Amino acid sequence: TLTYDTLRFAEFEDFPETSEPVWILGRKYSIFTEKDEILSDVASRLWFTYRKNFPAIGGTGPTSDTGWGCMLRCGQMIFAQALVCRHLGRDWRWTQRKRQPDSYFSVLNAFIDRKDSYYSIHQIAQMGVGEGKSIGQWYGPNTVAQVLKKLAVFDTWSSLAVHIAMDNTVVMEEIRRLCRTSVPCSPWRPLVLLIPLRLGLTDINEAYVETLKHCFMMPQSLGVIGGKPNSAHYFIGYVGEELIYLDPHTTQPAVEGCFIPDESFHCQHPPCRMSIAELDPSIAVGFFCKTEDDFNDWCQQVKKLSLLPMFELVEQQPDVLNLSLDSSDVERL
To answer: Sign of dihedral through CA atoms 170, 176, 181, 184?
Structure first.
């Protein structure tokens, strides 16, 4: 039950001192003159790993998700980043020896391993059953995304709108129908947009690489979740031909007013890097648009990227994930 803690014995390497820009969730950095800021941004992200000794799920279920909940943990991380942007702002940073806002602890609390937290492993796992997934079963990006949408309905504090765009299409009228609370003279529910995709049979077609990089360069970028079963990762950026990510494969003891010892929820080891060409095909890309202007800006950026494609943007109108098979893929398949 501790052969799944792969992060414990992984190879860690410091960031290469090169001229290649370092992108972390819509923010561009230079490793030469902004190394501290880069490390601060990565460490600031809410990190969620396997946990142990938390209340049994459903009273008789697991007390640890080691070996099965890594995609659930990545789902928690990408959704937490959205809540951080929604309640704290993209410019917020976590620092030891500093008093964090009360909202920070409220966000963190929503991911604590107890059934009364909105996005706890308990609620995610239990909600997954309704999706046809038994507790203890590993999920794919699409499934965890569908679960988060249903869980967010109860979170009236955040009052988020979660849209999962299938068929590789983002219908703008659907987004407005989901987010508009009233006729514009908050009138807009902060939007968490998740787009499940499959960029290849065994690997991602190289033609998608450039599009994928651009997904981390938008002010609304929440990153990407994906990976093979029990090898899920939360990708938060890239540098050169590598993706930067947070890994949940380490089991930590569950953490028991406002204050919460939060050291274990911040990744302080050298940020994990992986070759883009080694990324599993099944992923879910996310974007956060707090206001309608943010959404409009996002659409404008998707227009360019498309013109100068993983998904299409249309104004109006089975849920399918389209796999673009090249001549070779058609043969190997």
So the answer is: positive
Question: Could you tell me how many residues make up the chain?
Answer: 333
Residue position matching structure tokens 């988020």: 160
Residue 292's DSSP bridge partners are none
Known catalytic residues are: 70, 247, 249
**Rounded CA separation 100/120 (Å):** 21
Question: What phi-psi label fits residue 279: left (phi over 0), alpha (psi between -120 and 50 degrees) or beta?
Answer: beta
Residue pair 111/102 in contact by the 8 Å Cβ criterion: no
What is the span of the domain harbouring residue 226? Answer: 1-333
Method: X-ray
Q: Which of 95, 80, 120 is nearest to 41 (CA)?
A: 95
Question: What is the four-CA torsion angle of 17, 23, 27, 31, rounded to 10 degrees?
Answer: 0
Query: Per DSSP, what are the bridge partners of residue 233?
Result: 226
- Report the alpha-carbon distance of residue 73 to residue 140 in Å, rounded: 12
Q: Structural domain tally of the chain?
A: 1
Q: What is the resolution of this structure in A?
A: 1.9
- Answer for the pair 165, 195: CB distance below 8 angstroms, yes or no: yes
Q: Taking the CA of residue 38 as centre, how many other CA atoms within 13 Å lie in the half-sphere pointing to its CB?
A: 25
